[PDB]
Design a protein around this ligand. Sequence first.
Ligand SMILES: Cc1cn([C@H]2C[C@H](OP(=O)(O)O)[C@@H](COP(=O)(O)O)O2)c(=O)[nH]c1=O
Ligand SMILES: [Ca+2]
Length: 129
Amino acid sequence: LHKEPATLIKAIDGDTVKLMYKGQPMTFRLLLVDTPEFNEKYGPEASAFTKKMVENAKKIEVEFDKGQRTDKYGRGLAYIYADGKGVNEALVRQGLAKVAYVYKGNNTHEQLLRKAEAQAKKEKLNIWS
Ligand SMILES: Cc1cn([C@H]2C[C@H](OP(=O)(O)O)[C@@H](COP(=O)(O)O)O2)c(=O)[nH]c1=O
Ligand SMILES: [Ca+2]
């Protein structure tokens, strides 16, 4: 897989973000994770965490997996990085997302994220509390 440039347009919630990618505005949905919706428990904390991560970043990158790059809603499906750090993994590591929506052929970072989830669950963090 390879990292490509993008710039923040706007934070949306825990696992969606609006980015400019190849010069066009797109909503991105983070692969392999699921944050609570804003109205659910840890929803607000998940949104705040992703917001801080992407807003503070000097450099946002998007990384597509091997499979479909857009979902049925026209959202881009990617791993997103903020100053080289995985947002997807950071959320799971902090117990603010669950590994989820693991579809065959877009699952390159599955095992890396499951290892993160295990540590968050061990630490009883947030969702796992
Ligand atoms: C993360 C992801 C979600 N989706 C679709 C599946 C779910 O369809 P449904 O809307 O019919 O439930 C929805 C979950 O996204 P959200 O968790 O943002 O709601 O997004 C994909 O198709 N591919 C993906 O990789
Ligand atoms: Ca969600």
